[PDB]
Design a protein around this ligand. Structure first.
Ligand SMILES: O[C@@H]1[C@@H](O)[C@H](O)OC[C@H]1O
Ligand code: NA
Ligand code: NA
Lengths: 502, 502
């Protein structure tokens, strides 16, 4: 039904690598877990993410800020044992931290308000000049351990979602500015080449972006990028074990992206880089939507178009290794992770890997397909089909004419939908086991992979035709490439002489 | 000084393998750490430890006990996500848990009192019958996942050091006896072949052993083994960063072993196995005695002799991965472990591995040397020399006549003292760097190995004579073996034709 004719030689855009700039994570402290490193290693073997963005560098499980008593004095001590082990392991894996400065260490806090099950503290420092010394020592170490050519490649975003009272005492904008100003000026004094930015808010308070940008311009506090989080979840229904959420169409997020690029172009900093340091449909770590093939198909458009607007958009999160809502109580529990425990890829993970196949040169693109040409001049394409309702049009038919100037083509297709690459479904059939056996795990691994099919055909009249129908919530990848047939070189080759009817 | 003549074909005792039955660890929640799994794997490549003993199975970071509110009714939830991953990894490595029931999960607790930096609740359960259901469900889960044959090889130790008020409210003995009865009867109802035991007391309250064994006999309360801890630290000096302690002679601890055996010999269970579930010199996690060559020399006698009295004795702990006194603040910091961070083995580690060379038939044993015969009739021996003070007497000389019925002999010596295998000395030389660099760490690993030297002697009069002198805090191992010289099979063999003066 959707008929598409690609003309020989015409392009319409550049597909950039923004989609794999940065990915999200459970709290920095959780990076100590073997399951985390096993997960991060597995992701990094498949998607060359450049940066990792996680809360809680200054939380007390990481244990940086402590206080010793000598006489009646109270003198600080900065403990780097854990963060060293962590950042080391990031860099050995091949990924750098998107440092998020937060939250408040308990012995520097002014109040007792906390966020999450791990009770990160969200009050301003009782003494702002002792918070200045923490930040400067923390940055100075790093330069000493990792060296400046390395640490200046690390961006520093200041705090998390201050426009919400649950993350920042009273959601006090003025006090958030004092905090941003003290913190970035501590960082810059150690090394001015370190890029910093903010204000890390979620949608629904976009005036914060104008207020924050004016505040940095009127005073002379530096800002080298903007950050903001984008979700699409309508208000949620709660449960002892679940949070259920409806969602806006994915266009609601892409619209939010561009109106944010608009704000920055009318800002005192018209070329500011924008980093969406968190994004997903539902915004709760226990929402089953994250486990489904729907969330793969639904998020796919963001990877196609998101880089038209923002310099990075970081999927929350790479792994279910997460503790914000306590320890998960079931293998499939609605976690943010691209990867469920035991390195079982979710549908969303495979969707991400498909974009490894996109070239820079965009042949075509609408709301539900992306077609690109790689440097070897083979053609690849990714189509999705997110289906929000029982009553919606369920299938999505494509007929695509593709020019090729060679005579024998090889087609490779990877499909994930409700049937293929859907371990959640098998998990359900298995009885929804909360704590499955090894054998159950390995069977979920066997299914947790895209259906892969291959075709060979002769090219007639300088083009080929791909006709295919996406079912409910499918994402698929096609790769079209030239065959240099070598069968002529096999003397006496005759398949018909093989038992088996060949 | 110390002249020894091994008479041909005579033995005394038998050297059993109790020394490697069991080893200790930081709390079970710390087993999620990559650094922890890396250290355990490292230890188990060198010492075949059968069991691993650690606090806090029921602590709330492992997350097992939780509550849900459907109605106003609160019902219980048992979350096995973390504990499954932990015991799975123990089993894959090849070690089993010496299960320690404890401490108290927050939602079952009757009071606010906690132990350690990680705040384990040490009050009894507010409702002993909801404590019983926890035990039943945890053990039934273990059996469901791992199988009857496997879990019934896991011994269950009830609580930890209840004679101390810091580990158990008011050090109430009756309250503990009720806890022990309720817990093990829950255990036994799930499967009566699970070995239970106690009372896991600290030293200095040994009447508890009489009271607890009598209590069980009187009231038909199962007990399949006794447990107790043995340390030797005198009352400590405290510092913002250190705990310093003197120690009794090591004879003091071997005395406690033979003493507690006597009590169970005089009890209604005269054949009770005894497990010394923690031991070390100093009992504090920030006491540098643990990092020194002295502790290796000092602790050697118990490996040599402890098995005469107790069925197991488990060194606290296998690794510095530990949080009882907050996150360690320097590479060497006095931690309990055989192994420091980044797998840098301490002298005590090497001392242990030496005992892999002891055969079962003992040829000769005193306070400072053990000489054994392996099955191929080669002879091996470990000698040590702990020097407690600068006065004392610092060197120990040895002259050992070993008979052999073969003419050509090969001797291999391994030595650790203050000069060799002492990464602590090098770290001091380096500046005591709290957070060393990779190059520093790698240099420390280069020196953290025994000195290894080899010898060839033609035997005169059917015996060889080992002559060596132990420096201060030294441990050494020799191995004596037959040589079948194959040099006659090399035709034209002449080293004198190799440039180099050979
Ligand atoms: O921490 C994240 C928070 O910032 C956002 O509101 O929702 C996702 C959470 O996990
Ligand atoms: Na379409
Ligand atoms: Na988390």
């Amino acid at each position: 039904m959707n008929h598409i004719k690609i003309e020989k030689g015409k392009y319409v855009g550049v597909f950039p690598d923004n989609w794999k700039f940065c990915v999200g994570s459970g709290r920095i402290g959780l990076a100590l877990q073997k399951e985390y490193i096993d997960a991060l290693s597995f992701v990094k073997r498949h998607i060359d993410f450049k940066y990792l963005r996680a809360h809680g560098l200054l939380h007390d499980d990481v244990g940086i800020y402590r206080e010793d008593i000598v006489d009646g004095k109270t003198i600080p001590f900065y403990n780097f044992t854990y963060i060293d082990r962590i950042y080391d392991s990031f860099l050995e894996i091949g990924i750098r931290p998107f440092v998020e400065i937060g939250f408040m260490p308990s012995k520097l806090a002014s109040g007792d308000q906390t966020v999450f099950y791990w009770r990160g503290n969200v009050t301003p420092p009782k003494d702002y000049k002792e918070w200045e010394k923490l930040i400067k020592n923390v940055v100075k170490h790093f330069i000493d351990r990792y060296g400046e050519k390395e640490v200046t490649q690390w961006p520093f975003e200041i705090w998390n979602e201050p426009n919400l009272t649950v993350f920042w005492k009273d959601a006090n904008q003025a006090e958030y500015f004092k905090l941003y100003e003290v913190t970035v000026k501590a960082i810059k004094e150690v090394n001015e080449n370190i890029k910093v930015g903010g204000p890390a808010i979620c949608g629904g308070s976009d005036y914060w972006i104008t207020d924050f940008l004016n505040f940095c311009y009127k005073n002379n506090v530096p800002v080298d990028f903007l950050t903001r989080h984008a979700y699409t979840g309508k208000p949620p229904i709660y449960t002892p074990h679940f949070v259920y959420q409806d969602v806006h169409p994915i266009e609601y997020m892409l619209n939010e992206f561009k109106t944010v690029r608009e704000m920055v172009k009318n800002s005192p900093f018209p070329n500011l880089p924008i980093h969406i340091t968190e994004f997903n449909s539902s915004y709760h770590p226990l929402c089953p939507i994250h486990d489904t093939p729907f969330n793969a198909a639904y998020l796919a458009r963001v990877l196609s178009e998101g880089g038209d607007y923002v310099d990075s958009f970081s999927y929350w999160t790479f792994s279910d290794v997460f503790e914000e809502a306590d320890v998960p109580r079931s293998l499939f529990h609605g976690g943010f992770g691209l990867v469920a425990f035991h390195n079982i890829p979710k549908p969303v993970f495979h969707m991400f890997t498909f974009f490894n196949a996109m070239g820079e040169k965009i042949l075509y693109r609408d709301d539900h397909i992306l077609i690109t040409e790689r440097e070897d001049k083979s053609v690849a394409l990714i189509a999705w089909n997110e289906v929000m309702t029982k009553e919606e049009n369920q299938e999505r038919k494509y007929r695509i004419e593709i020019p090729v100037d060679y005579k024998e083509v090889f087609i490779k297709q990877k499909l994930i939908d409700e049937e293929y690459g859907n371990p959640w479904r098998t998990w359900i059939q298995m009885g929804r086991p909360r704590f499955p056996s090894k054998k159950q795990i390995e069977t979920l691994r066997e299914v947790a992979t895209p259906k892969v099919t291959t075709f060979r055909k002769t090219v007639e009249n300088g083009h080929i035709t791909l006709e295919f129908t996406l079912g409910k919530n499918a994402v698929t990848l096609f790769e079209i490439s030239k065959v240099i047939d070598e069968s002529h070189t096999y003397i006496g080759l005759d398949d018909s002489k093989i038992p088996g009817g060949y």
